[PDB]
């Protein structure tokens with residue numbers, strides 16, 4: 001129903017392999033790979049505000065689903081794309097050669113980013129306030 | 130008694146002036162000045178683990194009060210200093226020409242950094258899980 005919440009990272013797979021494939025420096029990969037931080041989502045209808053803790057970087061993006069928006073990526077690049085809401089619990093987008101799926105089931109968000117044969121998966125649990 | 134918990138930034142004063150004075154790149158100042166993230170402290174006696182969201186950076190430091198510690202600063206430089214306990218609810222340290230005071234008051238933390246005539250003040254609030 002609503003994506004709003006603070007989410008603490010529980011586990012992830014292929015962080016290092018994904019970040020190397022997009023060109024992050026090895027120095028930032030090593031600094032960030034063990035951080036299990038908190039990301040925040042605020043949903044207002046079709047409007048989303050994301051404050052994402054990704055490794056050692058915090059990225060703050062905002063978009064309305066179905067509308068073209070400029071979003072900052074891990075590399076600092078701003079890509080123009082459209083995120084769609086599938087059902088009430090799946091956010092889907094593609095940018096560059098990455099497919100991204102954000103799925104909410106109960107209190108668990110699973111984010112799956114696919115690049116070639118690397119599936120980068122993050123599992124985060126809502127903080128029950 | 131215990132600093133442990135997750136804290137969300139509520140307000141801060143003089144972020145830009147302080148970050149300029151320590152020499153942070155202007156591009157990082159502009160993107161970080163409006164981020165209100167979550168920091169986590171894990172305390173075990175005199176031993177502290179900090180996962181700090183500061184602007185657009187995540188900084189992870191560890192240390193024991195009264196022991197010499199090597200800590201990463203906002204610029205990525207590593208400094209050696211000693212963190213002291215003042216009372217039971219204040220951590221104090223000096224490094225370079227900065228004095229940092231971290232004060233716990235129930236569910237509120239006030240971090241005050243003084244650099245010459247600039248007082249960079251952050252007020253955060255415990256996330257109640």
Ligand SMILES: CCCCCCCCCCCCCCCC(=O)O
Nearest residue numbers: 007039052054073074109111122124
């Ligand atoms: C598509 C623009 C964002 C680029 C950043 C990529 C790094 C992973 C992003 C996943 C965050 C999605 C929200 C769930 C919470 C989380 O996993 O932190």
Ligand SMILES: CCCCCCCCCCCCCCCC(=O)O
Nearest residue numbers: 168181183202203229238240251253
């Ligand atoms: C003393 C070096 C720490 C790194 C410098 C980063 C600048 C901001 C540090 C303040 C964080 C203190 C913890 C309280 C929670 C918070 O304010 O996020």
